[PDB]
Design a protein around this nucleic acid. Sequence first.
DNA 1: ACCGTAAACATGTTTACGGT
DNA 2: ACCGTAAACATGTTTACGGT
Lengths: 76, 79
Amino acid sequence: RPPYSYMAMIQFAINSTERKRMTLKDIYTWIEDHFPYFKHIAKPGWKNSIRHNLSLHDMFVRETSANGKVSFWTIH
Amino acid sequence: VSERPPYSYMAMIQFAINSTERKRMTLKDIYTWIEDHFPYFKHIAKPGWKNSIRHNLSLHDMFVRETSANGKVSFWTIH
DNA sequence: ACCGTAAACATGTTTACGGT
DNA sequence: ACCGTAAACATGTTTACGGT
């Protein structure tokens, strides 16, 4: 287990992007890649904890692309 | 009167979306607009019609979505 | 091809509880 | 006080089928 909260590990991913925005599936991939704990050990429930933290903490606001066909997560 | 209205789902959605000042509407306000302007969906239809409306929104490409600045409200808009 | 219906899966919103 | 974890509900994305 990594010594970071979900809110912490999520913002790490979003801050790692060029356009200060990240898709949910790209948040999973970033956490799986940068913390091998979630790729090999954690039960599939950790993706539920990720969605739970995003909607709850107000720092995570979403925004839609110009094409209006992709919904991103960004920090305020 | 509440007999079925002669409009497709895509049609009744555009009526709702275009009836706003900013050509935009939240999903719950689309249900409410169709329920209020066509009592068929308020008194008769089984809960599946809300599944078909969402189905129409995602499938037809003319229905694109837009988010508020507060990032806490998701709208449906036409381009 | 088009519309309507159903259902599975992905994603976003909430309440709820035990433990760090 | 609040995280971590679970589950129910709302919303968005898809494939699949029968009928006109």
